[PDB]
Design a protein around this ligand. Sequence first.
Ligand SMILES: [Ca+2]
Ligand SMILES: [Ca+2]
Ligand SMILES: [Ca+2]
Ligand SMILES: [Ca+2]
Ligand SMILES: [Ca+2]
Ligand SMILES: [Ca+2]
Ligand SMILES: [Ca+2]
Ligand SMILES: [Ca+2]
Ligand SMILES: [Ca+2]
Ligand SMILES: [Ca+2]
Lengths: 206, 206, 206, 206, 206
Amino acid sequence: QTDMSRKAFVFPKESDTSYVSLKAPLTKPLKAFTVCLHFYTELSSTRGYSIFSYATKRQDNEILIFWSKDIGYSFTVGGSEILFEVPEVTVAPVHICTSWESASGIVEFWVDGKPRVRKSLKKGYTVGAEASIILGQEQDSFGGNFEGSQSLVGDIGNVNMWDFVLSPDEINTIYLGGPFSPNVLNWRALKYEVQGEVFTKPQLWP
Amino acid sequence: QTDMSRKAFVFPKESDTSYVSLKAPLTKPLKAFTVCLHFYTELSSTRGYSIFSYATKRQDNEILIFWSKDIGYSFTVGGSEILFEVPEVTVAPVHICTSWESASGIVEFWVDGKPRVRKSLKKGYTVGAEASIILGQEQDSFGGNFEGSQSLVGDIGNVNMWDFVLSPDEINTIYLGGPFSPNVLNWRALKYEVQGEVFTKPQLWP
Amino acid sequence: QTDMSRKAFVFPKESDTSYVSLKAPLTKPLKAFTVCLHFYTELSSTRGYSIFSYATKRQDNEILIFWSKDIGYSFTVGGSEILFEVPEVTVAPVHICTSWESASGIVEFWVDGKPRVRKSLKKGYTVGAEASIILGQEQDSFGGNFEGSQSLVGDIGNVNMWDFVLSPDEINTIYLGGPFSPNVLNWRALKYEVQGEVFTKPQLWP
Amino acid sequence: QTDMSRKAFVFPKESDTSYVSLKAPLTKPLKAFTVCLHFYTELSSTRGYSIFSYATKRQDNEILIFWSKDIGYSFTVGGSEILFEVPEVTVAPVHICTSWESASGIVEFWVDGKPRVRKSLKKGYTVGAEASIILGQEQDSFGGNFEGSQSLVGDIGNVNMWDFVLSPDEINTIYLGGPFSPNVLNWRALKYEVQGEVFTKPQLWP
Amino acid sequence: QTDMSRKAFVFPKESDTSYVSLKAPLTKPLKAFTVCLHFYTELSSTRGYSIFSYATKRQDNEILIFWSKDIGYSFTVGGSEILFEVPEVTVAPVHICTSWESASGIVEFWVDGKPRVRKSLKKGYTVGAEASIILGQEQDSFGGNFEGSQSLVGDIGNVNMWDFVLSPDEINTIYLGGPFSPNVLNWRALKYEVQGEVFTKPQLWP
Ligand SMILES: [Ca+2]
Ligand SMILES: [Ca+2]
Ligand SMILES: [Ca+2]
Ligand SMILES: [Ca+2]
Ligand SMILES: [Ca+2]
Ligand SMILES: [Ca+2]
Ligand SMILES: [Ca+2]
Ligand SMILES: [Ca+2]
Ligand SMILES: [Ca+2]
Ligand SMILES: [Ca+2]
């Protein structure tokens, strides 16, 4: 494993082959999760891009966080989708956290420390454990079938995952970078595999 | 009793059946009241919603705090209505306090700690104590006849009620969360009954 | 005397009869004056209203402070008028001070602690002491002929008057509420008669 | 001499006769100068006005600081002119400093402590010492031929002049009002004569 | 060598002859570099201008930092160009740092301490050491072929160059002006020749 602290993956070209695959030590289905990350890109006004894609062999979009052009963050689990409208956006590194819970289907979305309204999605579903997690691309098959028009360009980092809904206080400490210990995916202790033209560089955001 | 401190009711789907019923230990008719609450929703640009509905068997809108699309907070007592117009609204958790007094009909409305201009409403009226308090829905009969297009979606909390007009200093301490003791309806010591899909979750607003 | 400190007159309803008459212990004709007050109203976008009317039997507008719709503060002495234009205004409690001096006709106007440009008015005039001061209405006779379309609605308070031009330092102290002692009209030591539907309530502005 | 500290000349009427003549104890021809002053007027959106007019018998505009309607500040020396455009103007007391130097023709313009880009004007010129300095009017003859449509209305003060280019540090101290000692024209040690109605009043700006 | 600290080059007029030529003790070809500078000009709305032109006999735009009218900063190495678009600009002194690295082609651009998204340019190229560095003009031949419509007007200074990519922490130090040692081009110890009318003056920016 690698401690990616203060580092970020840079995807400086649009391509259908620059991606990184992240490995989860996960063996039980997720009844709930939280995923938090920084990403920085200018694409937001030109086209959509996949921020974070979680797929399982039965489901290519088992979790997907997706910017949709002039709409905002698509969030979807089990292929079903909700929009968190972002009517205007400024070019700056954006931190997000997002969390989901089968027991209620409550989705929380958090942008730069501010909560979005809780919404309902896929109540009672379960997210499969056998996951191909990929950054930089949107995958339409397990680990593959990328689309260049959906690749990310720019940076992504601090990618952390918990198998539970972080409380708003926890989310606040994440945004401020207080001490925390993810247990599904941990940027301090990441296991990953890099494919194509991708670079690791010091993070631009503080 | 339940101490709902740090908790909010989440109404994640539009429906005609998600509501909570709040019980007041009230027997004296109200010559005056103050009601203060937090709510968070995105509906404000799309459609109206009930924020707080107080009914009595003679009067389905005995007190109603309502958002009317592109107008603002409708406030009404005994069915008579006034508008505190809000020409720009931003998606953030909004605190309101509102206070009324039979002796003068003075309505005070207070959004996020800022007073709206005092207005006159229903001077000399009285608000009945034989009351059904409902959150999440607008009731057109004592405890029912909800209209889904008027339900709340998102969150509501800190729902507190006093049988007197809180002074501006008191309302300031409410907005800052100083110590206070509601005596009609107390969020730290609430009696409530939940129906349908409604969840209790950590409050998103601080 | 009444100590109106922390109190304000509330004019919650449009009428041609809600007014308060303020009594000045004044017998010297004024060569100069300063008047400072808090008022709060939403009328500013809909219609004009009198903020402060000082009349004498030969002159119904001996001093008038008047909001004129989409123009701003009309200020007039001895019927002669000037405008301190306000091209856009926001609904907040607004403090004004204004000062005039026969020796020069220099009018000072101050809004929320900011000076407006000094303008000339009625150089060499004098303001009669045999005066009726009314809040909530505009006089067209020495105590009457009000027009409801010119009444104030909302609140007015801290109405203080000096028979001299306060220095900018003094006016700063007023706006911050430092210690000051008016000598024509003192809100801590006011003499007034209330008429019609008018109430005294705690001031909304700090 | 008069110590005009904390005082300003008030020009409350448009006229072709109200002006102040300032006397400089100056005999050496100026190879460089700095002028700093506060002025406050609403004319900026209605019409142009002279801020500061320095003439010599050869040349009516030997130094002119001028506001030209919707263009901004006009700075001219020896009749030749440059513009420091101001597309957005707000009604507030505006401090300026302006410096010029024959050796380079570098003009510095400073507004409210912010530098404008250095520009070239009249390299190798020299400004005559046999000078008439007038505030409130623009002169087209050594002490006259004013035009009312070019008079200033409002206030002017802290009019200081140095026979050298103040460094940016010096100009910063001026804007903050630190210790400084002008040697061509000193507001703290002014020689002047007032003509027409012009009033000395306490400065409205701090 | 001249310690240009606190000084800036002033280019007060548009011309095809105002330039300064900067000398580097450089003999190894650059696999990477960082260049940081302050410049101040109003041209940004009127026309494009050179900010920093580095040329080699084989390549007239071996590094060029350029403003493209209504586009933003053009950055190019080896004659190939990328845009860091700036949709709205305000007239203030702007600090930039920009860095490039042959190993990846990662271009970093930083404006006033804020990072632009990393982009890919000329991966695997190398910047020649036998270089003519010119400020105030864009070269089209080694040391010459200037075009007046592309000259800079205003100020440039603190021009520093490193033969490596400064980390974001380093660049933050530069923007705050902490201690640093450039090793290709050092403003504290600059070697240069001035041609035409260019002046050294105290820097306007802090
Ligand atoms: Ca897909
Ligand atoms: Ca796809
Ligand atoms: Ca109803
Ligand atoms: Ca209904
Ligand atoms: Ca009248
Ligand atoms: Ca009238
Ligand atoms: Ca002239
Ligand atoms: Ca003229
Ligand atoms: Ca070229
Ligand atoms: Ca060229």
